[PDB]
Ligand binder design. Structure first.
Ligand SMILES: CCCCCCCCCCCCCCCCCC(=O)OC[C@H](COP(=O)([O-])OCC(O)COP(=O)([O-])OC[C@@H](COC(=O)CCCCCCCCCCCCCCCCC)OC(=O)CCCCCCCCCCCCCCCCC)OC(=O)CCCCCCCCCCCCCCCCC
Ligand SMILES: CCCCCCCCCCCCCCCCCC(=O)OC[C@H](COP(=O)([O-])OCC(O)COP(=O)([O-])OC[C@@H](COC(=O)CCCCCCCCCCCCCCCCC)OC(=O)CCCCCCCCCCCCCCCCC)OC(=O)CCCCCCCCCCCCCCCCC
Ligand SMILES: CCCCCCCCCCCCCCCCCC(=O)OC[C@H](COP(=O)([O-])OCC[N+](C)(C)C)OC(=O)CCCCCCCCCCCCCCCCC
Ligand SMILES: CCCCCCCCCCCCCCCCCC(=O)OC[C@H](COP(=O)([O-])OCC[N+](C)(C)C)OC(=O)CCCCCCCCCCCCCCCCC
Ligand SMILES: CCCCCCCCCCCCCCCCCC(=O)OC[C@H](COP(=O)(O)OCCN)OC(=O)CCCCCCCCCCCCCCCCC
Ligand code: FES
Ligand code: FES
Lengths: 116, 188, 50, 100, 53
């Protein structure tokens, strides 16, 4: 499961959960589906080569399901855990057996941000 | 997964800390972060089994918090009671319970609505050694709480900087300019 | 009207109304300015004609 | 220089000190208000401020309220209770959440 | 009559709360596995649709 959090120009914040298998990356031109197995959208170090577009087959936004929802990850954005990001984009199921829990309550509800 | 494994060698991870920073460096009640290692997976998972994960320390909500000497960070996001402070005359040696959540019905002082609203912001109990007039914060974001430190001006500036706040402010501005222009053009 | 028709439906964004009882004390007085202005205008015009 | 204690509920944690302070302030106020009645009368924890039949004097009770409020930096709610004795004064002072 | 007045009578009902306890569970903690902030962060995500999540 991947949780995507987005915001609008009016300050409304929408968080939606999507199963990993519903992702489908697009080519750099956005006019076709990029091969899931061999997809080149991450630089050598891990960042995005270009703004990556991915189509979700089914997205549940505000309790309403929609078909073929296209979303974008701007190149001007930090990418954490490039392996996990690539797996989510390609639709793989990530094995999280080797996991640790860090207790850091650094985020408050409705926390402010620069995305306004 | 062959491609992902091949690229994992040169892939690099980045820190997951953002503008909000770390709460333990600004909140005395937030313990420093600690990593907990899960135990080995259970060979048999009984239907009525309980978690074996190591326990995490539980910190209950305090009734009130002391005065942070200019190093106050609210536990939650408080309601903006007002955009300018209250010029209140405080008595010498009298304990005051300044409201942190921002919904108090008794003014700057705590009224009890913190216990009825879902928030980790607790009233600040403080005392003053010299009676006189003080500017008590109303936006509830002052770092020198309960005392105002002109953070309301920066809050107003951020509201104006926001796309929707800019629209609201200037829509009201042009609404008043409507009256101004009607008065200016009244005679024709 | 637009907000209610677009977001307040159960499908989109229902809100958990936890408020028990109302607490308004002078909202009626604040709102009655507009009908007050209506009455003032009516009285002024009627008296000027009379 | 004596640094004030960090803990808040000192009066609650020290019932004896609070009772002694209450007795002192009430005695001083009574001697200033009605000397002829309280100059020769010691004030203890069991002392009450009613007549021999049980009727209370509102003037004396409000004087005690003012003395206690000035001493402890709190606001006594007269309409809710009346301080007719040292025991009631102690009860109200301990009930108050911010006495000092 | 002698036996009735030689022993205590059955008690009558009393409606005083003796050491009352919270009807719900413990108050959510400031910090821990689940805090009041987690509850506070739920009002903004509320939907009742025609399909499961
Ligand atoms: C044709 C036009 C062309 C234009 C071209 C373009 C121009 C570009 C210009 C660019 C710059 C513009 C700047 C605009 C600023 C807008 C933003 C803003 O201010 O908000 C930030 C503001 C931050 O505030 P702050 O600066 O930090 O101050 C907070 C202090 O607590 C505030 O408290 P304080 O410390 O200031 O205390 C005030 C006062 C408190 O005392 C009082 O109670 C006030 C009255 C005292 C008696 C005065 C007698 C004279 C007659 C007074 C009549 C009104 C009194 C009403 C009292 C009601 C009481 C219930 O202090 C006293 O105790 C009394 C002192 C009296 C000394 C006498 C001095 C000489 C006479 C003048 C006195 C003025 C007193 C202030 C009046 C304020 C309004 C009521 O953010 C907010 O919180 C917003 C609150 C809501 C604001 C609504 C109003 C918005 C408009 C304000 C600006 C007005 C500009 C008008 C210009 C018109 C030109 C045509
Ligand atoms: C023989 C004698 C006969 C005498 C006859 C009678 C005299 C004539 C009639 C007098 C009527 C008086 C009505 C006001 C009652 C005041 C009650 C009072 O004293 O409360 C104690 C109250 C609490 O006392 P306290 O607990 O000891 O605290 C003391 C602290 O210093 C407290 O300081 P603080 O910082 O905590 O707060 C002070 C101030 C500090 O914050 C503020 O200033 C609040 C508002 C501004 C915030 C942002 C600051 C940045 C600058 C903003 C600039 C705004 C410009 C746009 C203003 C609106 C559009 C014009 O905030 C406020 O006061 C809040 C008010 C918010 C609403 C303001 C809306 C005003 C509407 C009317 C405007 C009229 C303009 C006329 C201009 C004429 C010349 C062109 O203290 C005060 O209110 C202090 C001021 C004392 C009263 C000054 C009154 C000045 C004259 C007002 C005339 C109003 C128009 C005429 C109406 C009647 C005739 C039609
Ligand atoms: C003979 C031919 C003659 C032709 C003459 C033509 C004249 C043309 C005059 C153009 C005037 C332009 C005014 C706006 C300038 C904005 C500058 C800017 O970017 O500021 C950012 C700065 C930065 O503000 P900030 O950073 O604090 O927050 C806003 C930031 N954004 C918007 C990015 C989220 O804004 C300000 O500080 C305010 C500036 C003034 C804003 C005025 C808004 C007017 C709204 C009008 C709405 C439509 C109605 C128009 C008609 C009625 C008008 C009364
Ligand atoms: C100022 C903006 C409008 C400008 C244009 C219209 C002129 C001005 C109108 C002023 C309206 C003021 C009251 C409404 C706004 C709220 C203000 C407020 O605090 O109100 C509560 C105040 C106080 O009422 P209150 O104390 O009962 O308020 C509620 C009290 N608690 C909270 C305890 C329940 O109302 C008034 O003071 C109203 C009476 C004003 C003084 C007496 C003269 C008027 C009497 C009634 C007039 C009837 C109609 C007249 C029609 C014309 C005749 C020629
Ligand atoms: C900052 C950079 C840009 C500005 C730089 C300085 C000016 C540069 C040159 C501008 C040239 C174009 C405008 C020239 C004036 C045009 C004629 C005019 O405005 O006449 C008024 C006209 C008719 O109005 P009327 O009802 O007959 O008279 C009312 C009397 N109270 O009015 C109308 O028809 C009503 C139209 C709305 C007018 C609202 C404002 C009043 C008129 C002000 C005119 C002066 C210029 C204003 C420019 C504002 C720019 C933001
Ligand atoms: S702190 Fe705002 S009500 Fe207690
Ligand atoms: S009112 Fe909060 S800083 Fe001035």
């Amino acid at each position: 499961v991947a949780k995507i959090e987005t915001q609008s120009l009016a300050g409304d914040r929408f968080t939606s959960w999507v199963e990993t298998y519903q992702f489908h990356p697009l080519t750099q031109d956005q006019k076709n589906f990029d091969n899931q197995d061999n997809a080149e959208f991450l630089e050598d170090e891990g960042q995005l080569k270009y703004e990556l577009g991915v189509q979700l087959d089914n997205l549940q936004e505000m309790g309403t399901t929609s078909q073929d929802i296209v979303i974008n990850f701007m190149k001007e954005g930090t990418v954490h855990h490039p392996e996990l990001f690539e797996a989510i984009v390609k639709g793989y199921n990530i094995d999280t057996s080797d996991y640790v829990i860090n207790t850091a309550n650094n985020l408050r509800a409705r926390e402010g941000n620069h995305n306004h | 997964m062959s491609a992902i494994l091949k690229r994992a060698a040169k892939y690099k991870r980045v820190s997951s800390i953002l503008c909000e920073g770390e709460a333990h460096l600004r909140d005395p009640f937030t313990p420093p972060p600690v990593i907990l290692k899960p135990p080995a997976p259970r060979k048999d998972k009984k239907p009525d089994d309980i978690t074996d994960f190591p326990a995490q320390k539980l910190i209950p909500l305090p009734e009130s918090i002391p005065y942070q000497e200019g190093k106050y960070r609210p536990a939650s996001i408080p309601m903006v009671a007002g955009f300018f402070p209250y010029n209140c005359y405080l008595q010498q040696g009298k304990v005051y319970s300044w409201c942190s959540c921002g919904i108090s019905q008794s003014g700057p002082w705590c009224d009890g609505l913190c216990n009825s609203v879902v928030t980790r912001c607790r009233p600040v109990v403080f005392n003053v050694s010299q009676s006189g007039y003080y500017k008590i914060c109303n936006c509830k974001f002052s770092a020198n709480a309960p005392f105002c430190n002109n953070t309301h001006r920066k809050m107003v500036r951020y509201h104006h900087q926001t796309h929707r706040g800019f629209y609201e402010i200037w829509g009201a501005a042009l609404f008043v300019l409507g009256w101004v222009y009607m008065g200016f053009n009244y005679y024709t | 009207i637009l907000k209610v028709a677009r977001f307040r439906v159960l499908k989109m964004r229902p809100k958990i109304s936890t408020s028990y009882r109302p607490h308004g004390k002078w909202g009626d007085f604040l709102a009655c300015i507009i009908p007050l202005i209506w009455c003032i205008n009516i009285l002024t015009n009627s008296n000027l004609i009379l | 220089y004596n640094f004030p204690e960090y803990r808040t509920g000192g009066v609650q944690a020290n019932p004896g000190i609070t009772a002694k302070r209450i007795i002192k302030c009430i005695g001083e106020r009574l001697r200033k208000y009605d000397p002829a009645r309280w100059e020769n009368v010691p004030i203890t924890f069991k002392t009450h401020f009613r007549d021999e039949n049980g009727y209370s004097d509102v003037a004396t009770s409000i004087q005690i309220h003012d003395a206690l409020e000035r001493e402890f930096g709190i606001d006594i709610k007269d309409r809710l209770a009346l301080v007719t004795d040292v025991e009631t004064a102690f009860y109200i002072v301990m009930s108050h959440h911010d006495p000092l | 009559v002698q036996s009735q007045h030689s022993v205590p009578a059955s008690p009558i009902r009393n409606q005083r709360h003796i050491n009352p306890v919270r009807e719900s569970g413990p108050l959510p903690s400031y910090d821990g596995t689940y805090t009041m902030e987690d509850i506070r962060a739920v009002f903004y995500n509320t939907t009742v649709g025609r399909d499961y999540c």
